[PDB]
Amino acid sequence: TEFWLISAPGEKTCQQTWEKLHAATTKNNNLAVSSKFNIPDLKVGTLDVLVGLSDELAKLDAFVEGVVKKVAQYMADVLEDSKDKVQENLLASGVDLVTYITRFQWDMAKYPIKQSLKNISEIIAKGVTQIDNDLKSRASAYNNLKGNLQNLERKNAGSLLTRSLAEIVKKDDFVLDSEYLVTLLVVVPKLNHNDWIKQYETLAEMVVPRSSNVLSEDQDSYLCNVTLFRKAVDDFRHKARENKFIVRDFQYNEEEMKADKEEMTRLSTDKKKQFGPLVRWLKVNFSEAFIAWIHIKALRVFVESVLRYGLPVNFQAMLLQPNKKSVKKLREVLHELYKHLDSSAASQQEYYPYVYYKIDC
Amino acid sequence: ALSDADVQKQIKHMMAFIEQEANEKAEEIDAKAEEEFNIEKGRLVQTQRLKIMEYY
Amino acid sequence: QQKYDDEDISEDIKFLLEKLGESVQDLSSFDEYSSELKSGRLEWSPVHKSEKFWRENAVRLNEKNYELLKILTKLLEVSDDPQVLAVAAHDVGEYVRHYPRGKRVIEQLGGKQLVMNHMHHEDQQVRYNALLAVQKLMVHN
Amino acid sequence: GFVAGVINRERIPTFERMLWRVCRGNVFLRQAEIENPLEDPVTGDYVHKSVFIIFFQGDQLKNRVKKICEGFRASLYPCPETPQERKEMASGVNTRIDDLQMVLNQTEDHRQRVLQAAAKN
């Protein structure tokens, strides 16, 4: 939900109630929720350097928006009952997003304010970069494992032409310890099963007679084998390829499919056993990421208020929830309530006569 | 967006934060004075200690 | 440009062109040049307009304490002969054309006032050359 | 030090508005006006001039505002400073402008008097 964050010069200490609800300066006559913002005591540090510091702070805030949006889109890419609007109810560090936003509170233990706010912004940037890189690494590894799992899933996909025979065929249909007998699985459809099974000597000579024995049946064609001399396989394939007889020289071994299936199951299980930790990691990381997001927004509000008011740091910051589709009426009201602050000059655009920021879902 | 006196108010803003900058520079200069005192006193004490030890 | 069947004409004109090139190149020098500039006898030699002298050999005019430039200022003040005045003024102009530092030196000396005085003069040719020199001084000024 | 830009009025209110919003205009308003102008150096418009300056002393502002002002319109090449000896030297240059305009007049007279000789034939 879309929240405004407005600051005022604070010429009067009764403005705390004005932030709270006060009717004489309320929004749509108490139809919109107004709330006081947490105003701590933070030093100034610099003014002439602070202009460039604020510009770089805005650039860092844009980068913060990019990285947190990437965190959100990967959270939606989590999947497994946690796709997009599924779990649209995400949690701001264990509480509701709305709950934290409306109950914003600041703590110094994250960053001692006795240090330069430039140092603090750089440390937040370092932490943000570190978690961004952690997200990149985790996403890359998990996507590679997902690709491996999907490849193994597609290994069970395709016709006899484009897929193996792991769970259809047995070892004993093939000649065992042969001298020169090569057993070829020539897939034959039911459209030509009788032709293959009764014209096999006419297909090629030098073949084992009466080896026209059916193996199994799949959903579109039938499966069978031809046992014949090694060179005669060439002639058999050459004549058979033009009578709807597909050639598939399937090789069987216990390991050749058992190991692949066992690895597929193991990879799936390990992907799930990392999926759990992935949910926990994303939760705990996005907690602090979004906390620091609001924190850097608040720092931007603070520095802008100090720059744009005067020597004392006595400003009145406040969160606000404009009533739906009455933003125009509140625009009129707030223009009337904020033009008088200067009364000399202040087109608004982003250059309002007041200090404003936004935050939304 | 300033009146005929608010321009002077913001001139005073720059002036008084320059006062705070001067105070902070003075405090850091006293810090440098303490640190310079420490290192130079230690170095001089070291040299005089060396001379007395060799003489003794 | 006029070609002829006689090999003598073509070979001799080519050979003379090369030798005359050597002659003018050897004539293009600074030693006898500075000797005559010192003596104050400034005839219109073609070496004065030789671009290569001012492209590479220009710094030679900067003698000890700019002796050549100051003595040419003195000789300009002294002599009244239009042609030597023109020659010296053109040489000074072509020298100052490339060294904007020596331009400040000349401005400090005050030769610009001498050239301004010689601008209005009975010889309009000297006036025209003085305008060219003052203009080369008006470069960035 | 303080610098006053050179602009032929035009869009002072809107441009200085954008400057007020971007830079937080805070310093004293220096006002000046020149009537009886000269034709503009690069187009030739015979347009009066008027200036309303607020110039900051911070370096980041000195560069950003310089960029914006030179981008729109100004001549920030001059930079007035505290000593008055530079001002006296510049007034010496101003008295020298007399000599320079005389030389330009001489050049114009010469270029106008040389042409008729060729034109006659």
DSSP structure string for D75-117: -------S-SHHHHHHHHHHHHHHHHHHHHHHHHHHHHHHHHH
- DSSP assignment, residue A208? P
d(CA B8, CA A161): 88
**Residue A178 structure tokens:** 């042969």
Q: How far apart are the first and last CA of chain C?
A: 45
Put simply, the answer to whether D100 touches C134 (Cβ < 8 Å) is: no
Counting DSSP H helices and E strands in chain B, the numbers are 1, 0
Experimental method: cryo-EM
Closest chain D C-alpha to B3 CA, distance in angstroms = 10
Do A36 and A335 touch, CB atoms closer than 8 A? Answer: no
Residue C89, number of CB atoms within 10 A of its CB: 26
In angstroms, what CA-CA distances link A294 with A187, A196, A318, B16, D92?
65, 75, 13, 31, 61
Q: At residue B2, what is the residue type?
A: L
Give the closest residue to C68 by CA, choosing from C96, C100, C27. C96
D59 touches chain B (CB under 8 A): no
Residue A235, number of CB atoms within 10 A of its CB: 16
CB pairs under 8 A between A and B: 23
B residues 1..56 contacting A (CB < 8 A): 1-3, 6, 9-10, 12-14, 16-17, 20
d(CA A227, CA A324): 79
Resolution of this structure in Å = 4.5
Closest chain B C-alpha to A281 CA, distance in angstroms = 44
**Cα atoms in the Cβ-side hemisphere of radius 13 Å centred on A155:** 14
C139 touches chain D (CB under 8 A): no
d(CA A102, CA A262): 51
Q: Give one DSSP letter per residue of A24-84, joined into a string.
A: GG-STTTTSEEEEPP--------SHHHHHHHHHHHHHHHHHHHHHHHHHHHHHHH-SS-SS
Do A264 and A164 touch, CB atoms closer than 8 A? Answer: no
d(CA C68, CA C65): 9
Put simply, the answer to whether A345 touches D58 (Cβ < 8 Å) is: no
C47 touches chain D (CB under 8 A): no
Q: List chain D residues with CB under 8 Å of B13.
A: 26
CA-derived radius of gyration, chain C? 18
Backbone angles phi, psi at D53, to 5 degrees: -105, 140
Q: At residue A148, what is the residue type?
A: N
d(CA A328, CA B35): 61
With both helix axes pointing from N to C terminus, report the angle between A254-309 and A117-155 in degrees, rounded to the nearest 10.
Answer: 160
- Which are the contacts of A298, defined by CB distance < 8 A and separation ≥ 6? A5, A37, A38, A104, A106, A317
d(CA A200, CA D42): 98
